[PDB]
Design a protein around this ligand. Structure first.
Ligand SMILES: NC(=O)C1=CN([C@@H]2O[C@H](COP(=O)(O)OP(=O)(O)OC[C@H]3O[C@@H](n4cnc5c(N)ncnc54)[C@H](O)[C@@H]3O)[C@@H](O)[C@H]2O)C=CC1
Ligand SMILES: NC(=O)C1=CN([C@@H]2O[C@H](COP(=O)(O)OP(=O)(O)OC[C@H]3O[C@@H](n4cnc5c(N)ncnc54)[C@H](O)[C@@H]3O)[C@@H](O)[C@H]2O)C=CC1
Ligand SMILES: O=c1ccn([C@@H]2O[C@H](COP(=O)(O)O)[C@@H](O)[C@H]2O)c(=O)[nH]1
Ligand SMILES: O=c1ccn([C@@H]2O[C@H](COP(=O)(O)O)[C@@H](O)[C@H]2O)c(=O)[nH]1
Lengths: 377, 377
């Protein structure tokens, strides 16, 4: 087979999948930003990913880009939708407008193309949109990549999951396996809504794991015990393992805080204690960490690098204690009403306690006033 | 070195450790039950463990037993304490009387022996007892074996943890490594109280993991989704894994229900949400399972095999629905006021719904009225 696969959205997800598949098939990448398309046609990547830029520039890929929807979608066997979406936990609103616009466009231009959604969507999205528009050609397949290793994670994926049990779903899984470097990749075919719930449950388990080791750490600090001794002893049980067990100021990042809340909203009519506790536990852990810091009676707290550390900052400021921030990447001189100190040495002198989620070489000479719960970094 | 190691308590734990060490050193096993000692001296095991009976009967072990404390403890380099203890969650009482009696006896008879406690004790026990009696010769080392594979788990241990950082603790770890079949066993030396908390945190993580996959299963049932599809997709993430993820009526057994509660009691002054939720989650899961069963409006519920299933039974009976029990191992004709039916066929005919924690071959012909959440058994 030599198929045509269109990518809608040339960001980390679209380009990871597109470059992977362009090694063996015809890929046409569609974006709405003409300048990104022009760059791609010059074999220049519009994003930061080593492998994508290396592949685009150095390997023979049957790849091209366009802003023309008709040129992109005509004769496509599959269209991978990788446009932006966003879930807002405060309102429980999942903005899927770009995905719905693409489904609209493909349905109109090429109703025979099979759309594969890689964008994050709410649980039940695909079953519902098919029913609403009265179409059958949409399948969800979760994307497991990490930014910065976008192409790498699809060259060496943990597994491939396609949310339809059919020969056309299997042929799509084959495209992902064919472009990968890793061999005998675990492949799983499920029904739609089930596939859409996988990442929420996987990411929430990771947040649960971090929240648990953080509660173990709260206990160890409270009791004057060596947290590393306990954690290493526990994690030597092969059913538990030595990963994702490094204490911190709370789970953070781009996915976990929102996904745990998104999953909890989905449990609104399902009795549970663990799902709700995962969200509450992070707030409790931040209160514990802030209270530990405040018990040292600092006159100035220094925050070394800026994300769960933001919650610690908020709590310290709520008690009227000034916070100064060391963050080279930030160019402003203020962040949430607190001074950003550009000079590391001045920051070190002024701060009575320096908090940092993870230890860093450059804090070694002031280690005595650094508060971090990092054990394994 | 060729040392003398005394075992106090010849049950699963004492005999596993004693037979292991008797392969290379002089072991004298002490019990209070003369008949168990007499059996041991005839090379007959007083417990059910294949490897222990095989080793006792067929390998050249420098092993003997006695009820004489003086004969047992004199000249011992180490005394492994493996007497019964019990934690009662209702009262938060940990009965360590047998361990304290042995410490008393050893201190009096041979104050130079180094005691290694393998019995389960409360967190902080060893530090406190040393301080109370003004002695230094007591060290806690957790025991990770499973009944039925008692000797096997010490021939192939996950890891060895000794709750003292010293050369004498290391020499004890060496005895455990020397008798084992498994090589390069992970070995960890910690301070006392830290070692004593390891199993509670490890077992509570296992209960948390089961409670989490059970909440995922509650959601799947509630939403009409295929739980196996979701769980397999999630567990293919290598940070999560395909173990301890089989839905059930709640975590049960001999250790998890009590250890989770014991750990929660230890968190009485430590802010947390996850530790308390692990206990509450099991009650919620049992309520969900019972409610699912009751929604089928059965006139008689059959319970196939008797332990979290007991909680389901209690809840069904609380609603006035009769329960019948199929449990060949039980000889009584009543269990908690419910009929025990000896004949499997009569049990099958009468029960409108048959609940079972795990599926079983012999329920195949009535599969249509069996309710089990088992996926991987
Ligand atoms: N970045 C990540 O780590 C992961 C992201 N995802 C999901 O994948 C989707 C895309 O994420 P990214 O690749 O990071 O987005 P991105 O923002 O890096 O790239 C999105 C691209 O879509 C283009 N675009 C916007 N509307 C469009 C339309 N109607 N038609 C064609 N192109 C359009 C944008 O101009 C942009 O180039 C989101 O739903 C995201 O949540 C999934 C797994 C990992
Ligand atoms: N069975 C298990 O799965 C595990 C048990 N443990 C702990 O190890 C300890 C022992 O458990 P088991 O071996 O299963 O007990 P067991 O009940 O099978 O054997 C205990 C032995 O100690 C004897 N004994 C009682 N008082 C004594 C005394 N003052 N001096 C000498 N012997 C005495 C009893 O007669 C009996 O033979 C407990 O603290 C238990 O919680 C730890 C890990 C696993
Ligand atoms: O051992 C760990 C692993 C991860 N995290 C936190 O969980 C979130 C997700 O981490 P990652 O999977 O993006 O690396 C991040 O805030 C990370 O700091 C921890 O606190 N400890
Ligand atoms: O996948 C699993 C693994 C264990 N358990 C439960 O957790 C408790 C401890 O199991 P084990 O570690 O003794 O096998 C038992 O009630 C067991 O049924 C489950 O429900 N699902």
């Amino acid at each position: 087979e030599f198929m045509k696969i269109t990518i809608s959205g040339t960001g980390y997800v679209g380009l990871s999948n597109g470059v992977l598949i362009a090694q063996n098939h015809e890929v046409v990448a569609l974006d709405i930003v003409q300048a990104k398309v022009d760059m791609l046609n010059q074999k220049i990547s519009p994003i930061v990913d080593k492998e994508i830029q290396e592949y685009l520039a150095e390997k023979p890929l049957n790849f091209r880009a366009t802003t023309d929807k008709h040129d992109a979608y005509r004769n496509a066997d599959y269209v991978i939708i990788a446009t932006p979406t966003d879930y807002d936990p405060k309102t429980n609103y999942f903005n899927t407008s770009t995905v719905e616009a693409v489904i609209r466009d493909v349905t109109e231009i090429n109703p025979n193309a099979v759309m594969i959604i890689k964008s994050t969507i709410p649980v039940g999205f695909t079953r519902d949109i098919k029913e609403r528009l009265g179409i059958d050609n949409v399948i969800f397949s979760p994307e497991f990549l990490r930014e910065g290793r976008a192409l790498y994670d699809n060259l060496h994926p943990s597994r491939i999951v396609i949310g339809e049990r059919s020969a056309r779903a299997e042929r799509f899984a084959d495209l992902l396996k064919e472009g990968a470097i890793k061999q005998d990749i675990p492949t799983l075919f499920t029904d739609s809504t089930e596939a859409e719930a996988i990442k929420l449950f996987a990411n929430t388990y990771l947040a649960l794991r971090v929240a648990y080791f953080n509660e173990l750490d709260s206990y160890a600090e409270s009791q004057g015990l060596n947290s590393k001794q306990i954690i290493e002893g526990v994690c030597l049980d092969p059913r538990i393992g030595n990963h994702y067990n490094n204490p911190s100021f709370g789970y953070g990042g781009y996915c976990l805080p929102k996904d745990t809340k998104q999953l909890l909203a989905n449990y609104e009519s399902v009795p549970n204690n663990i799902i709700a506790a995962i969200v509450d536990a992070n707030r409790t852990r931040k209160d514990f960490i802030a209270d530990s810091i405040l018990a040292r009676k600092p006159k100035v707290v220094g925050v070394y690098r800026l994300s769960s550390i933001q919650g610690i900052m908020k709590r310290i400021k709520a008690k009227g204690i000034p916070v100064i921030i060391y963050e080279p990447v930030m160019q402003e001189d203020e962040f949430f009403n607190s001074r950003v100190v550009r000079d590391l040495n001045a920051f070190k002198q002024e701060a009575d306690v320096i908090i940092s989620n993870r230890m860093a070489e450059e804090l070694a000479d002031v280690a005595d006033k650094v508060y971090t719960r990092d054990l394994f970094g």
